[PDB]
Amino acid sequence: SHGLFKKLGIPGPTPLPFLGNILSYHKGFCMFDMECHKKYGKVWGFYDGQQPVLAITDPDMIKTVLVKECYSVFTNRRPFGPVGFMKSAISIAEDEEWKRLRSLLSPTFTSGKLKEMVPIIAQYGDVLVRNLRREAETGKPVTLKDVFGAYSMDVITSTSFGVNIDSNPQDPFVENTKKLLRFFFLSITVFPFLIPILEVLNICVFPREVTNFLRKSVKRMKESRFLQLMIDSQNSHKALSDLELVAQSIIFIFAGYETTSSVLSFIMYELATHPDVQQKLQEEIDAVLPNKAPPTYDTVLQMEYLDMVVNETLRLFPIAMRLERVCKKDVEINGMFIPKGVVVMIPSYALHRDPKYWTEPEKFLPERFSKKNKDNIDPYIYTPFGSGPRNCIGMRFALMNMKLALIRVLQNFSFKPCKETQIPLKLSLGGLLQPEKPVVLKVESR
Numbered sequence: 001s002h003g004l005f006k007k008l009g010i011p012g013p014t015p016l017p018f019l020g021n022i023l024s025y026h027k028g029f030c031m032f033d034m035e036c037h038k039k040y041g042k043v044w045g046f047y048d049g050q051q052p053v054l055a056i057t058d059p060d061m062i063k064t065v066l067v068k069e070c071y072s073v074f075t076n077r078r079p080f081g082p083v084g085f086m087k088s089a090i091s092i093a094e095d096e097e098w099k100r101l102r103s104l105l106s107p108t109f110t111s112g113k114l115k116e117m118v119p120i121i122a123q124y125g126d127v128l129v130r131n132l133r134r135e136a137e138t139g140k141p142v143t144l145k146d147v148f149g150a151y152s153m154d155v156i157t158s159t160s161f162g163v164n165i166d167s168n169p170q171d172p173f174v175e176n177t178k179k180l181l182r183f184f185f186l187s188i189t190v191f192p193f194l195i196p197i198l199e200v201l202n203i204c205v206f207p208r209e210v211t212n213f214l215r216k217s218v219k220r221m222k223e224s225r226f227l228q229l230m231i232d233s234q235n236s237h238k239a240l241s242d243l244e245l246v247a248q249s250i251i252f253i254f255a256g257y258e259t260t261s262s263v264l265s266f267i268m269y270e271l272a273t274h275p276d277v278q279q280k281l282q283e284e285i286d287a288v289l290p291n292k293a294p295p296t297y298d299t300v301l302q303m304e305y306l307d308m309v310v311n312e313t314l315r316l317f318p319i320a321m322r323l324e325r326v327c328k329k330d331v332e333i334n335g336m337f338i339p340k341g342v343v344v345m346i347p348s349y350a351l352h353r354d355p356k357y358w359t360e361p362e363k364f365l366p367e368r369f370s371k372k373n374k375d376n377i378d379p380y381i382y383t384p385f386g387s388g389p390r391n392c393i394g395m396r397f398a399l400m401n402m403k404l405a406l407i408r409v410l411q412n413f414s415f416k417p418c419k420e421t422q423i424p425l426k427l428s429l430g431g432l433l434q435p436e437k438p439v440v441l442k443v444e445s446r
């Protein structure tokens, strides 16, 4: 079983009997991918405990798994139990049930329905520059994740649950959300055979107290009246449960919160270490919005450079680090055989820094994304939101949301690196991609 990749002739780091290669994860997922890439080349295999994982690297082979053979063979992500009623959530859902849930949720993510939402999101822009200005008054350097955390939290909770929070007020609905996001898992990887053993017991990774509260909180709101567009949905190929509704709303918190605020801390870090880029971006804002005008959907999508800054940050810091897809059946793909059961992984972080596709990959250069160079960028090497039918269904919201907050904060302030800033940046050698040390900067009002 640990002889699968050898048998098939695929190089890979050698596994220990039960742990597979999980002890190599001590250096973080990113450096693990980078080293394997540089060492084993185009394709490599390893083991998360017992699970064969096959990393792939060819834009062609990637297109086949992420777009072409999506519905037929590479439909699902790694299973993860035990999840109870959350198996109804779109990111957890598998096969035809996922197909159905995805179809029912598209209409909720169109640009337009999103344009109809920028106002809701704009409220929280003010709230963010205020908290930011308050910390700037003090005269001391700012830990940005306090405010970007709060901002990301507020935008995501608002849009998914109705409630309109200024968290400031940090003991109503906020406290359940905090308790939901941050929760054994080491063990689950060694023994996926222990997952069925736990689901029988009704043991679930999402805490029942909170889910209940959240389940109630939507029943109340559904009565006293993304949430709306899902209500819209329940009136009219397929149906859509009340329990499935709340499940998508919880999932939106999980997907939108930490990714968004992480990206903002990174984006801010780079503008601060690259003053001529911050300068040019503020120059752009001041041209499209003459004197601190309210940001608009139609306005944002007219901002060339900003889109290049956001994209180049995601190139160097793709929060999900990898894309995964389970292989349903024996497949021959662009002249390579993949057996059923294997997890095919796309190493986004590593591919984003491959000297074959990017010149000087370590350096931050928004130019890569300029009108000139952009059309040679491979859409299967650059994947901060994944690709195909099972890509990030909230990609467009997230970009709009980040940009909104970027806009408001940037026209009002300016960012120098101070004393306690990390130079150069260290990355969280742990979970989802994050600065290893909270980003701290000097925030002067302009």
Ligand SMILES: CC[C@H]1OC(=O)[C@H](C)[C@@H](O[C@H]2C[C@@](C)(OC)[C@@H](O)[C@H](C)O2)[C@H](C)[C@@H](O[C@@H]2O[C@H](C)C[C@H](N(C)C)[C@H]2O)[C@](C)(O)C[C@@H](C)C(=O)[C@H](C)[C@@H](O)[C@]1(C)O
Residues within 6 Å of the ligand: 029, 080, 091, 092, 181, 183, 185, 251, 254, 255, 256, 259, 319, 320, 321, 322, 324, 431, 432
């Ligand atoms: C951004 C895009 C998405 O990210 C991912 O899928 C990556 C690739 C996973 O890493 C996968 C894949 C892999 C290989 O890492 C890349 C693996 O090592 C881990 C265990 O799971 C994450 C984070 C998972 O792990 C869990 O996230 C919790 C917040 C912390 C928890 N743990 C650390 C306490 C961990 O189990 C998990 C289950 O998918 C989170 C659930 C809630 C989701 O469905 C959410 C909404 C996601 O779809 C997502 C955030 O949008």
Ligand code: HEM
Residues within 6 Å of the ligand: 090, 091, 092, 102, 251, 252, 255, 256, 257, 259, 260, 263, 319, 320, 323, 324, 384, 385, 386, 387, 389, 390, 391, 392, 393, 394, 395, 397, 398, 399
């Ligand atoms: C920087 C911000 C964000 C990033 C980088 C991001 C990234 C991702 C990535 C990489 C995936 C996996 C794609 C793949 O596997 O091919 C994904 C899936 C998903 N994302 Fe996001 N996301 C962000 C914000 C959001 C927001 C704000 C929402 C909700 C509005 C959201 C909702 C979802 C959902 C529901 C899925 C699973 C889709 C499916 O399984 O069909 N994301 N996201």
